[PDB]
PDB file of C-alpha atoms in Angstrom:
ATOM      1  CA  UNK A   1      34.853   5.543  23.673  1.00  0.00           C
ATOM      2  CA  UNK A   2      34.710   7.108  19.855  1.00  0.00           C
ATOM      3  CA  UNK A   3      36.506   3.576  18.772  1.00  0.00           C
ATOM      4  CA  UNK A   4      33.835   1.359  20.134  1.00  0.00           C
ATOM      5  CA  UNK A   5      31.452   3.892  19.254  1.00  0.00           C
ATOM      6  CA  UNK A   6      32.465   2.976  15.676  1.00  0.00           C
ATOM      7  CA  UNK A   7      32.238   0.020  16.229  1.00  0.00           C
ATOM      8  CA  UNK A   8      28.516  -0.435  17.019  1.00  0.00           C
ATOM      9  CA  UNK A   9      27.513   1.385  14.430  1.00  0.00           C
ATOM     10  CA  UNK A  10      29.219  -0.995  12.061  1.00  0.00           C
ATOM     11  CA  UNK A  11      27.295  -3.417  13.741  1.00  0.00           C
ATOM     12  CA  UNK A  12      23.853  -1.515  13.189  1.00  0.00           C
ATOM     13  CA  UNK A  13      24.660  -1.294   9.679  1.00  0.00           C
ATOM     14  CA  UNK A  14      24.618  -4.511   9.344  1.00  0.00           C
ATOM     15  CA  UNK A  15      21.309  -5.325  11.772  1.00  0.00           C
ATOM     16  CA  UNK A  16      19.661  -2.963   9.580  1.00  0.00           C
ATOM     17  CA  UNK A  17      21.005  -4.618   6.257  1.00  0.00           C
ATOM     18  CA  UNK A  18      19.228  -7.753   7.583  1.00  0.00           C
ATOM     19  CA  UNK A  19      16.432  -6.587   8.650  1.00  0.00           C
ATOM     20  CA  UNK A  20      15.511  -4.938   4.863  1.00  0.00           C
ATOM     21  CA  UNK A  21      16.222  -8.253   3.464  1.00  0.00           C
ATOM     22  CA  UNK A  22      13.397 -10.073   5.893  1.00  0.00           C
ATOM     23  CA  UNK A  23      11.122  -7.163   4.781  1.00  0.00           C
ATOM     24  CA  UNK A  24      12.099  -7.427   1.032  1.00  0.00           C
ATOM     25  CA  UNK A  25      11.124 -11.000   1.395  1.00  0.00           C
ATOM     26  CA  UNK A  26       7.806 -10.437   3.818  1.00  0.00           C
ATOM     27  CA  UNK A  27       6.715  -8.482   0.584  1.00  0.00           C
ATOM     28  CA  UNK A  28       7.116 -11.327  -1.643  1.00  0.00           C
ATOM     29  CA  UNK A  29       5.028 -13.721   0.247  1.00  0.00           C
ATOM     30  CA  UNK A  30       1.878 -10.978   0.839  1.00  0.00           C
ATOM     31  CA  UNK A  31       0.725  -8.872  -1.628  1.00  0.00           C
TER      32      UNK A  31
ATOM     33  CA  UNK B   1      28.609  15.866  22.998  1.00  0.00           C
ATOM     34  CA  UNK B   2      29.561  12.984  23.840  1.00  0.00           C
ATOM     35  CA  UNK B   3      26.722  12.094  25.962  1.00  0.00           C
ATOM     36  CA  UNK B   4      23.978  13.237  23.109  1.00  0.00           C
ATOM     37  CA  UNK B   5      26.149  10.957  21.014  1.00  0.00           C
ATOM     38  CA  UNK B   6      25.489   7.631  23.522  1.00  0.00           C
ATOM     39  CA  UNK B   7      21.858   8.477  24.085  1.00  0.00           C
ATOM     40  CA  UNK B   8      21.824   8.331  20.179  1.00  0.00           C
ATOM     41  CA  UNK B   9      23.021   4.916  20.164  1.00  0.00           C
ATOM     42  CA  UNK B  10      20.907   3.495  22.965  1.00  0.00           C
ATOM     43  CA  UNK B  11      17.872   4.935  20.996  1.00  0.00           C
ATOM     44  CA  UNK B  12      19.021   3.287  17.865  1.00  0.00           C
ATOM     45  CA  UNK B  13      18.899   0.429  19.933  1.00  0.00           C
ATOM     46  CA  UNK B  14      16.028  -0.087  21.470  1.00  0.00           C
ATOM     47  CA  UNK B  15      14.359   0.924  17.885  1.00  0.00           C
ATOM     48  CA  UNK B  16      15.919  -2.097  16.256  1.00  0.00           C
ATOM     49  CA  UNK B  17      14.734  -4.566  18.773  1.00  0.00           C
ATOM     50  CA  UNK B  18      11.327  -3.330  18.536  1.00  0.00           C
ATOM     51  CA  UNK B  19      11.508  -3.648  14.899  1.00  0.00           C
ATOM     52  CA  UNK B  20      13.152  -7.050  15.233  1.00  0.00           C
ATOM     53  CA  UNK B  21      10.167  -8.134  17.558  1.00  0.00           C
ATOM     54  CA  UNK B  22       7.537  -6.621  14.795  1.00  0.00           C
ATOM     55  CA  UNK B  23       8.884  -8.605  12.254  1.00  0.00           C
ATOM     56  CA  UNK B  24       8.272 -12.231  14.236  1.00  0.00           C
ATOM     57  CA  UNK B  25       4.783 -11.689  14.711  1.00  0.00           C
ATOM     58  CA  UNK B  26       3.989 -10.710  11.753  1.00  0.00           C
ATOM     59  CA  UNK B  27       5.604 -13.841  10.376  1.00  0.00           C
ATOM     60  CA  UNK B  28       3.493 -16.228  12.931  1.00  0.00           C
ATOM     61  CA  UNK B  29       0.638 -14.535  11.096  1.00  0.00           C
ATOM     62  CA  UNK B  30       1.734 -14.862   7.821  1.00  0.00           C
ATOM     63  CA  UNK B  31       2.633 -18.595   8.370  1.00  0.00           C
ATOM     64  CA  UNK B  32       3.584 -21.197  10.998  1.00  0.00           C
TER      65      UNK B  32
ATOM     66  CA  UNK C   1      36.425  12.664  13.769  1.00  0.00           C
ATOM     67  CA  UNK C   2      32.929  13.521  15.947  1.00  0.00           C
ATOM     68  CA  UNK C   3      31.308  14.976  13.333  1.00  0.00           C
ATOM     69  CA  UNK C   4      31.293  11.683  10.668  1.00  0.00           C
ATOM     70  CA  UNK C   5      29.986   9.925  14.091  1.00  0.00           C
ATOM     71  CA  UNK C   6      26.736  12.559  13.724  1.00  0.00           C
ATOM     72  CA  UNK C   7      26.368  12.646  10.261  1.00  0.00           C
ATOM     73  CA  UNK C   8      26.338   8.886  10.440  1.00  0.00           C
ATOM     74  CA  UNK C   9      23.896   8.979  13.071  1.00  0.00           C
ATOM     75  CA  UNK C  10      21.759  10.499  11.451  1.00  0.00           C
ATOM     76  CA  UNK C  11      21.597   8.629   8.514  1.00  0.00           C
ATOM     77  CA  UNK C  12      20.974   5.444  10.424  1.00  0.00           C
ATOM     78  CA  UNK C  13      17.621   7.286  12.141  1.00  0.00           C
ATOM     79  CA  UNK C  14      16.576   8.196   9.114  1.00  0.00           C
ATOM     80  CA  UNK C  15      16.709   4.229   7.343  1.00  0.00           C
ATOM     81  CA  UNK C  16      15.654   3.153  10.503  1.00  0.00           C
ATOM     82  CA  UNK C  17      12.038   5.813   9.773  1.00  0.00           C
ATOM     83  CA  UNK C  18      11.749   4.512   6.507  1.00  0.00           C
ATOM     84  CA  UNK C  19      11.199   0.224   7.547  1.00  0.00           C
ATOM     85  CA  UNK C  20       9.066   1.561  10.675  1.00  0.00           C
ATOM     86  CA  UNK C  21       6.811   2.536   7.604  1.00  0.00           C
ATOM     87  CA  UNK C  22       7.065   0.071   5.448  1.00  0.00           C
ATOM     88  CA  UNK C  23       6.674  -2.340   8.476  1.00  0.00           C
ATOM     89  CA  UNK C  24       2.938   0.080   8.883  1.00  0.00           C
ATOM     90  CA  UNK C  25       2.171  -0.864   5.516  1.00  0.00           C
ATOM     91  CA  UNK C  26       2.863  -4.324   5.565  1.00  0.00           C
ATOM     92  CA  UNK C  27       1.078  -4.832   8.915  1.00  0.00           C
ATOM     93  CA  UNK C  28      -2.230  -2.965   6.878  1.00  0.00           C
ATOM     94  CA  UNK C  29      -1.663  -5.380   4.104  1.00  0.00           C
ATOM     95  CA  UNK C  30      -2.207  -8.471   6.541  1.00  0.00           C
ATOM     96  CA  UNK C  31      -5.262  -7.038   8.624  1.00  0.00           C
ATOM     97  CA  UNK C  32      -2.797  -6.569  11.553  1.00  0.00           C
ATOM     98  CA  UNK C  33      -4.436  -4.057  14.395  1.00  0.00           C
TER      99      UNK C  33
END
């Protein structure tokens, strides 16, 4: 468990990484 | 623990995917 | 080893707070509601 447990969250780090990109872009198109 | 631990992660989860759906409409909106 | 699990945790829930606001902000910006 504790090893794949890891391993999602170095998944979610990178969902999240994304995700702040799409919104730092998002902010560039409005105002 | 353990178990606080996994309902944690299932939480972070379904968080994302809401986010993730957020994020598409609000780009139909802002464009095609 | 359990404890860096937690602390990292938390510091995902708390990034994860801070776009559910901007997202709030953004969504004002546009008129959505």
């Amino acid at each position: 468990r504790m090893k794949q447990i890891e391993d999602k969250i170095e998944e979610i780090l990178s969902k999240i990484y994304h995700i702040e990109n799409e919104i730092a872009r998002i902010k560039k198109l409005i105002g």
